């Protein structure tokens, strides 16, 4: 059971991103640290550099790159990431 | 009054962003809408690259360019202004 309201990436990339998110949530407690770990993992695997935003309640409005922006919600928080 | 948690930009740019955020908050009363208005104002003011995030429980660690970063708290909401 998962949810991804909006994303722009390859099917294999989305599966890898989902797997990375679960590993980051399992191996990190601080939201910023998990976001930094996810960003570094994404950067090392999806053509650095990029950025991500982690929180609990925040409206998003930005202009990312084509096929370089994903968003999903897991556990209690929601994750939004996009390549700079 | 607004308190800047973190800021890496010109003082005039920081003041301009504060004025835009206050004007957007007075006009737009929705977190997504206020951020969109702030992002639109920021892009037309300083440079085409812009990144406005509006929220109350959003703490993220993302790489940002020099002289193009700002994070200020106005009232009860948190505003993060940067260039994409």
């Amino acid at each position: 059971k998962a949810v991804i309201k909006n994303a722009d990436m390859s099917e294999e990339m989305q599966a890898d991103a989902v797997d990375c998110a679960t590993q980051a949530l399992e191996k990190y407690n601080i939201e910023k640290d998990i976001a930094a770990y996810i960003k570094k993992e994404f950067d090392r695997k999806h053509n650095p550099t990029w950025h991500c935003i982690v929180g609990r309640n925040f409206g998003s409005y930005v202009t990312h790159e084509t096929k370089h922006f994903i968003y999903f919600y897991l556990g209690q928080v929601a994750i939004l990431l996009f390549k700079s | 009054k607004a308190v800047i948690k973190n800021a890496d930009m010109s003082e005039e740019m920081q003041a301009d962003a504060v004025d835009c955020a206050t004007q957007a908050l007075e006009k737009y009363n929705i977190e997504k809408d206020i951020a969109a208005y702030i992002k639109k104002e920021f892009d037309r003011k300083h440079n085409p690259t812009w990144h406005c995030i509006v929220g109350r429980n959003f703490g993220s660690y993302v790489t940002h360019e020099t002289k193009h970063f700002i994070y200020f708290y106005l009232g009860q909401v948190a505003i993060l202004l940067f260039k994409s």
Binding site: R56, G59, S60, F69, Y73, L80 | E31, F58
Partner: peptide, 23 residues
């Protein structure tokens, strides 16, 4: 280009003549 959102009371009383010896 994108839009998104997220402990018992004790009573003690000194009795009359209990602590005082007249002699």
């Amino acid at each position: 280009d994108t839009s998104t959102q997220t402990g018992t009371d004790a009573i003690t009383q000194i009795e009359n003549g209990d602590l005082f010896d007249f002699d």
